[PDB]
Ligand binder design. Structure first.
Ligand SMILES: *[C@@H]1O[C@H](CO)[C@@H](O)[C@H](O)[C@H]1NC(C)=O
Ligand SMILES: *[C@@H]1O[C@H](CO)[C@@H](O)[C@H](O)[C@H]1NC(C)=O
Lengths: 50, 50
């Protein structure tokens, strides 16, 4: 749903340039709020825990 | 030491609340603790915001 999708390239062959949207996708994982779940309402906290 | 309160960056910049944290800065010496590319981003935003 967000814009300017970047992909982590083949870093194992000649690529040492880092994937710059690491913390961006991490922020996507931080704001991931849910209510459905068999184990229960799973939601990441400020440290990424249940 | 006239220490202004610690500005904390949790994720990549939203430019909504982090811009307010840059507007809270009014001191002289800025002590920055991040990576190199994040320092480039913060200095580019600081030059963009004067
Ligand atoms: C992705 O690239 C576009 C320009 O092509 C620009 O909006 C920005 O630099 C990048 N990310 C966002 C916020 O879309
Ligand atoms: C955990 O407890 C809440 C409140 O009782 C409940 O809504 C949720 O379904 C529970 N998760 C499990 C173990 O199913």
């Amino acid at each position: 749903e967000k814009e300017n999708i970047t992909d982590p390239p083949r870093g194992c062959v000649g690529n040492t340039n880092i994937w710059k949207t690491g913390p961006l996708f991490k922020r996507v994982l931080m704001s991931s709020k849910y209510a459905d779940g068999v184990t229960g309402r799973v939601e990441f906290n400020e440290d990424g825990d249940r | 030491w006239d220490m202004q309160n610690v500005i904390t960056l949790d994720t990549s910049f939203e430019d909504a609340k982090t811009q307010v944290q840059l507007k809270k800065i009014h001191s002289s010496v800025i002590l920055l603790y991040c990576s190199k590319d994040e320092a480039v981003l913060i200095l580019s935003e600081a030059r963009s915001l004067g």
